[PDB]
Amino acid sequence: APAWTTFRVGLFCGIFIVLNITLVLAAVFKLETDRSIWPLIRIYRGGFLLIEFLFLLGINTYGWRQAGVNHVLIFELNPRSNLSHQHLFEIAGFLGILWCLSLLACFFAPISVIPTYVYPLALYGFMVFFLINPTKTFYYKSRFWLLKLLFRVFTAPFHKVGFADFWLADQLNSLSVILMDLEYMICFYSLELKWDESKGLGICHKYTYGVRAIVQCIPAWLRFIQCLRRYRDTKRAFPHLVNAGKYSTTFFMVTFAALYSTHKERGHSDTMVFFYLWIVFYIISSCYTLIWDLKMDWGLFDKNAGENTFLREEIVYPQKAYYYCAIIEDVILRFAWTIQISITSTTLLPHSGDIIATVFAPLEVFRRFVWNFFRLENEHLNNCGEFRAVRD
Amino acid sequence: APAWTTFRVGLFCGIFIVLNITLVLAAVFKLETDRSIWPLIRIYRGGFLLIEFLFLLGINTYGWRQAGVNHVLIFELNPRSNLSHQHLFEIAGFLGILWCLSLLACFFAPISVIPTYVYPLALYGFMVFFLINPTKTFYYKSRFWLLKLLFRVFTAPFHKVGFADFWLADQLNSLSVILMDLEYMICFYSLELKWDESKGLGICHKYTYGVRAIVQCIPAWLRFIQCLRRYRDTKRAFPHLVNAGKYSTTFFMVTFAALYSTHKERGHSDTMVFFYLWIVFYIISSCYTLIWDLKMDWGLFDKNAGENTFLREEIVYPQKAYYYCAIIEDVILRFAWTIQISITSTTLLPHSGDIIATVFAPLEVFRRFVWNFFRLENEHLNNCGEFRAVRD
Numbered sequence: 179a180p181a182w183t184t185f186r187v188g189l190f191c192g193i194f195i196v197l198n199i200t201l202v203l204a205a206v207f208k209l210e211t212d213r214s215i216w217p218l219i220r221i222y223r224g225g226f227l228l229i230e231f232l233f234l235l236g237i238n239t240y241g242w243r244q245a246g247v248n249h250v251l252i253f254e255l256n257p258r259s260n261l262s263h264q265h266l267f268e269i270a271g272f273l274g275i276l277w278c279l280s281l282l283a284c285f286f287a288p289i290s291v292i293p294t295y296v297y298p299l300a301l302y303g304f305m306v307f308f309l310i311n312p313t314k315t316f317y318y319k320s321r322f323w324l325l326k327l328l329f330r331v332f333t334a335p336f337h338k339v340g341f342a343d344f345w346l347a348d349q350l351n352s353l354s355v356i357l358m359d360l361e362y363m364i365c366f367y368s369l370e371l372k373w374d375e376s377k378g379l380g381i382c383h384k385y386t387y388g389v390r391a392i393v394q395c396i397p398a399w400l401r402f403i404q405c406l407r408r409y410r411d412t413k414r415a416f417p418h419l420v421n422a423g424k425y426s427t428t429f430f431m432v433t434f435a436a437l438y439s440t441h442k443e444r445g446h447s448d449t450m451v452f453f454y455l456w457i458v459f460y461i462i463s464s465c466y467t468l469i470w471d472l473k474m475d476w477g478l479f480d481k482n483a484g485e486n487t488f489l490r491e492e493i494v495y496p497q498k499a500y501y502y503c504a505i506i507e508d509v510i511l512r513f514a515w516t517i518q519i520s521i522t523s524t525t526l527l528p529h530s531g532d533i534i535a536t537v538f539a540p541l542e543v544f545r546r547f548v549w550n551f552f553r554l555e556n557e558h559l560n561n562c563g564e565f566r567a568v569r570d
Numbered sequence: 571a572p573a574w575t576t577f578r579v580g581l582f583c584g585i586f587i588v589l590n591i592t593l594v595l596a597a598v599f600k601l602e603t604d605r606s607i608w609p610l611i612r613i614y615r616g617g618f619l620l621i622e623f624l625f626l627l628g629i630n631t632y633g634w635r636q637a638g639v640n641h642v643l644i645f646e647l648n649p650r651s652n653l654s655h656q657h658l659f660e661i662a663g664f665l666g667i668l669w670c671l672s673l674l675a676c677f678f679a680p681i682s683v684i685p686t687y688v689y690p691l692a693l694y695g696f697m698v699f700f701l702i703n704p705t706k707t708f709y710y711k712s713r714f715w716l717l718k719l720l721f722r723v724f725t726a727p728f729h730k731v732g733f734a735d736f737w738l739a740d741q742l743n744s745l746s747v748i749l750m751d752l753e754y755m756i757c758f759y760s761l762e763l764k765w766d767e768s769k770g771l772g773i774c775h776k777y778t779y780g781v782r783a784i785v786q787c788i789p790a791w792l793r794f795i796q797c798l799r800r801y802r803d804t805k806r807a808f809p810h811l812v813n814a815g816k817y818s819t820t821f822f823m824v825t826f827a828a829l830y831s832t833h834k835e836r837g838h839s840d841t842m843v844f845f846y847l848w849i850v851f852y853i854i855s856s857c858y859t860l861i862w863d864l865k866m867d868w869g870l871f872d873k874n875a876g877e878n879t880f881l882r883e884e885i886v887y888p889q890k891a892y893y894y895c896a897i898i899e900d901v902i903l904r905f906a907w908t909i910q911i912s913i914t915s916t917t918l919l920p921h922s923g924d925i926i927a928t929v930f931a932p933l934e935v936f937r938r939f940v941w942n943f944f945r946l947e948n949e950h951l952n953n954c955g956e957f958r959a960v961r962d
């Protein structure tokens with residue numbers, strides 16, 4: 179833990195705090211209500227979810243290292259240059275500084291020639307360039323490993339599914355709103371944005387063509403084909419076929435939600451039965467993922483609970499109360515997770531859908547933040563598939 | 571070096587940087603030229619000089635610890651809770667955050683009932699309360715020791731002059747502008763400020779009564795009586811009587827400057843001879859302090875220079891170039907130091923005097939910042955009076 183790294187973490191955090199406060203007062207006072215800000219909120223929602231995910235991942239690394247979870251061995255990382263929680267805090271703070279600067283430039287641009295629509299373009303282009311720059315520049319090893327993971331995950335059936343690919347695909351499953359906002363950004367730029375004055379003032383916000391439904395299922399598709407690949411490598415059905423079944427319930431729920439969405443403005447009598455199928459598959463998907471979490475992901479509700487009631491025997495975290503609020507928050511937010519996926523899969527809430535999505539996506543990142551703790555603790559305690567060698 | 575301390579240093583530094591930038595744009599755009607801002611600049615000049623002194627003192631502690639200067643033994647500090655450079659950076663950043671917040675409130679006050687003249691009052695009252703709070707609150711040991719020093723320095727003839735009293739009196743000699751702005755603050759509040767609207771829109775800025783001349787000589791008076799006390803304790807004249815002579819040259823230069831100032835508006839023919847005496851004593855004071863610096867304070871220009879030309883034999887700092895720019899900057903700024911004392915002692919520059927003082931006081935703090943390095947290095951190498959036991 180070098181002193182300059184901690185100093186950079188504090189410096190970036192302080193600049194981020196003051197820039198967030200400035201953003202707040204700018205929104206109340208400087209921001210004008212004439213311009214529609216929803217596309218801006220969607221683009222910067224994708225950015226903010228990425229930064230929040232990095233910050234919560236830093237907290238996750240802190241918890242793993244100071245609880246005993248050997249995440250370095252589980253992630254199959256070299257125990258020489260593994261990213262510490264401080265480095266994740268530094269990256270999150272730096273990208274948050276860029277995000278806040280881009281947002282402030284969108285509110286008031288202190289440049290006469292530069293237009294407003296380039297600040298999101300410049301911000302996300304800077305994220306991409308920082309990720310893919312060939313030179314041995316900041317954190318070269320970390321982003322090279324991350325880029326290899328991003329290549330292996332998005333081409334799943336052709337690579338053996340290790341722990342890192344599975345984990346990253348699940349994080350993308352929680353961060354599907356980032357892909358959704360990226361697709362919305364591309365569609366808005368290509369179709370709806372007038373490259374004349376600004377990004378304020380749309381066909382890309384509905385399911386006229388249903389492309390973002392494929393985008394929504396993309397992380398579920400990667401996880402589905404990863405489970406199928408694991409079945410192909412190891413001819414066993416209990417973990418992998420049932421997990422792929424869970425992801426296919428996500429598939430059916432999303433597509434039935436989309437069918438109901440297009441059928442409202444259409445008007446066939448099959449709309450009511452498409453509803454009924456939607457609640458059926460919504461309940462199936464929500465309970466499937468929730469029971470999978472508590473039983474196979476977290477490992478709780480074991481029959482060897484002992485003193486730790488409604489939990490497992492071995493526990494590495496200090497307070498059982500943490501496990502209990504984790505269970506409660508998982509039950510609450512898994513239904514909200516399916517709800518937000520459903521409304522993002524439909525167009526029937528053009529009044530509240532945007533706000534409920536914008537306030538539930540950070541809660542979904544927080545759910546996966548809590549999910550990481552107990553998932554990797556369960557993997558550390560007893561192997562779940564991806565070790566095949568020892569318990570640790 | 572705890573991680574949280576470095577994090578706090580970085581956090582305070584980042585907030586300070588962003589608040590300084592915000593202050594800059596507020597001054598260019600938000601600030602209105604109708605209100606006179608000179609009293610505001612004087613009050614916050616005192617505050618800013620204190621914060622700059624703390625930051626440069628942190629740099630001094632860094633240099634002393636990583637060059638070999640045993641400042642803990644020289645300052646007669648307990649080697650258990652001695653303030654590190656990080657703690658000084660933390661204090662400077664925190665007080666700078668308060669200073670920036672008070673200045674921003676003076677520019678735009680987001681409170682309808684609270685008037686503008688309380689933000690400097692609240693800021694300096696908070697500094698005083700932080701310094702003198704009886705409870706074992708932040709840095710209790712450090713400020714208790716500092717308060718004991720502040721008591722021993724301001725009552726000099728009745729205490730034996732140790733190194734810490736001498737050093738602090740010299741720092742106050744460099745920071746006499748802080749006392750000047752404090753006296754101006756008190757006079758402005760008691761006489762010129764109308765407690766109706768604000769502090770903007772004076773008899774306290776001239777020498778109608780000549781009280782701030784006594785304030786200017788107060789640090790020189792403390793050093794003068796400290797040298798006399800050291801003569802009384804040790805009956806030797808070469809160091810102490812000559813040093814007291816130097817401080818008395820400061821006395822004569824200040825009082826002759828004041829006499830010339832009052833005699834311009836008076837109009838006697840003795841004004842020209844008071845001028846002539848002023849340049850005589852200005853040159854005497856400037857060369858006295860400058861030669862004292864290089865010869866007795868820093869110890870340079872020794873006859874055992876050897877390879878280190880125009881310097882001394884033993885050198886703890888890496889590059890001799892540092893010593894050379896230090897000599898050049900000392901020759902340049904000692905004349906500027908006497909110049910700023912003279913114009914603050916007079917009223918003949920009511921056009922440029924305020925600005926030259928406001929830009930030379932930070933340069934005077936920087937001169938004492940450079941002076942600390944070589945003074946305590948000289949004391950570390952060979953004893954100068956205040957050891958009497960060993961060379962170290």
Ligand SMILES: CCCCCCCCCCCCCCCCCC(=O)O[C@H](COC(=O)CCCCCCCCCCCCCCC)COP(=O)(O)OCC[N+](C)(C)C
Pocket residue numbers: 220221222223224225228235239249253255256259260261269302305306309319320321322323324353356357359360363
């Ligand atoms: C509208 C929204 C548009 C969004 C824009 C597109 C997204 C921009 C993408 C760029 C931002 C991501 C910044 C990169 C941070 C990655 C840091 C990282 O991966 O640290 C990890 C830390 O190691 C760990 O596994 C512990 C914590 C788990 C790390 C999980 C990976 C982080 C995933 C975050 C990016 C996900 C991509 C999101 C795309 C939407 C890699 O470690 P290392 O490489 O340094 O050490 C391994 C040893 N070697 C290297 C030798 C093999």
Ligand SMILES: CCCCCCCCCCCCCCCCCC(=O)O[C@H](COC(=O)CCCCCCCCCCCCCCC)COP(=O)(O)OCC[N+](C)(C)C
Pocket residue numbers: 612613614615616617620627631641645647648651652653661694697698701711712713714715716745748749751752755
């Ligand atoms: C208009 C302008 C008005 C200005 C307002 C009035 C000024 C406000 C005054 C309050 C601000 C000062 C904040 C206090 C910081 C002091 C920190 C400090 O003294 O650290 C020092 C660090 O120790 C050192 O000696 C090394 C560096 C040299 C320290 C020099 C003292 C600092 C002087 C700064 C204040 C000067 C006062 C200025 C008044 C104008 C004390 O160490 P310690 O007490 O923690 O450890 C010693 C062991 N014991 C305690 C057991 C004996």
